[PDB]
Amino acid sequence: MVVIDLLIVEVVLFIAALLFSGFFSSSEVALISITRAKVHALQSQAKALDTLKRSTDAIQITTLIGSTIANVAVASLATAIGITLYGNLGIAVGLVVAAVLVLVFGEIGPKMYASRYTEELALRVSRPILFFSKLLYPVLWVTDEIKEWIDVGEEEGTIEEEERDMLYSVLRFGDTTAREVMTPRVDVVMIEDTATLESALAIFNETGFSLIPVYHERIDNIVGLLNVKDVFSAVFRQQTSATIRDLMYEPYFIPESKKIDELLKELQVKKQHMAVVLDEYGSFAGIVTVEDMLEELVHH
Amino acid sequence: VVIDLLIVEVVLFIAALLFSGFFSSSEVALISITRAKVHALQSQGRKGAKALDTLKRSTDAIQITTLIGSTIANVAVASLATAIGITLYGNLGIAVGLVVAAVLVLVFGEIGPKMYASRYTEELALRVSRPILFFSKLLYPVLWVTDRIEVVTEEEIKEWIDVGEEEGTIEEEERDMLYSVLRFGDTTAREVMTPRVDVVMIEDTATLESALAIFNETGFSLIPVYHERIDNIVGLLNVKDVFSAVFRQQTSATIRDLMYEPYFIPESKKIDELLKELQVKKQHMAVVLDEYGSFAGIVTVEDMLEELVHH
């Protein structure tokens, strides 16, 4: 080695470390700032961005470690370059200059400019941040009664006794879970992802339903939902190669602990109306229709 | 000497790592404390708090003051870890100083101190309120520089439902309950709050004998309390407690002694959340503030259920 050689190796490592911090700091801003619905439309038109968005906090962990390690090195290198140039006072010089640059070009700067060009930057840093996350994945693994309250309201003038019954259901609506209102697996209708469109139409008429699940060689592995309008329109327009895998649309899975009040709001946002349910092990449990949720309100 | 300067850097290293914990832990706790909770602290005779409000008015300043601090502090941790490191392990010490500083700053300077903020967001805020406020005053030039540098369609529900009615996934009979339940969740407190102007309150300095006059004149059972201005709500006063007092007061307790801290909420609190949150607290009224921390109205459980029942 040599003094000049090492210093030039350090300055390029110092220059590269600063540029790496900007990529990590600006990536969080662009990653999180993206609107959820806009991400789905782009995905339909990315796939890694949707993967990282599944765990919003995961993006924060990966980026945090990236920016922190990058900025530590900027100081580490500049203060080695600092002392080999100005002596013990070089740690002060290195601390001053490395501190100024990490803010200007390493954290403050890139965060602001990420909102201006948030579109292109978000997609460009989707894949690499997803690669770093897989590298930083092991560390991430380490991170990992009622009548009393109401009767009082009426006495305080808060509630009117006429509006008591309706209140009761609104409370039982939030407390109710998907496991209670759903339909059990044993009684659910199903069609495999490898079946002729003619057979689905039979199922659609024998049972009469419009959305029948699509399992994948196993009752536990649901891979899509099949609308009857998609099948009836497929056999009519003779498509020599028209399998269920094409017509099925990816479902929206939920846990058994999901409250039905949230489910109903979300389903009408995503233009869907049936939801698939999974258990703690990731198997298949049932299906909740908007009708199933409101059945308790219909029977009072 | 070599040994005495290595002793100066090892303590400054420990200190620099503590600052990054101060800036990092304070950043999490301060932003997460809801502005409705900050309003409660000021009227509570709480330590600091009055400073905690000054910072909450600017959401950028809190992010700049914590970023600038934790950055300079983390650069200092590394600058000192390589200074100590390079003297201990030659030119390989620049590498050890990068590893030790980067693994400690994350664990004990950024990630770890964030954990204490989540569990203790309130007390940490009042303990770090004033400090971050004089850091902002001296970081003023950069802050000015950074400031200079800086769909619920009615038809969608109808079509979406009728599409469901066609699928059989929804029923036509159950349309009303569905159209209403959607409006219930998407309704804010503002839309159901009795406006500030029409609210009847009692100043905390008033007499219990005067409170009774208000309870009878209006007929309400619970009337808010405003410490100095109508913009301010410091508590709610139940008539049942005022009557029991005047009957056997003896000590003549004032409003501040008999009132109770309200449930402050923002104008945006979806009533769907407000109902479950209020009935869990066994409380049925909720004061409603605004972004600037003023007073804007109140919400009772009937208000949230009125439009739904009458519809």
UniProtKB/TrEMBL annotation, chain A:
Membrane-spanning segments: 6-26, 61-83, 89-109
Domain CNNM transmembrane: 3-163
Name recorded for this polypeptide: Hemolysin, contains CBS domains
Compartments, as annotated in UniProt: Membrane
Record-listed ATP binding positions: T183, V189, F209, S210, L211, K229, H273, T289, D292
A GO-annotated cellular component: plasma membrane
Membrane topology value: Multi-pass membrane protein
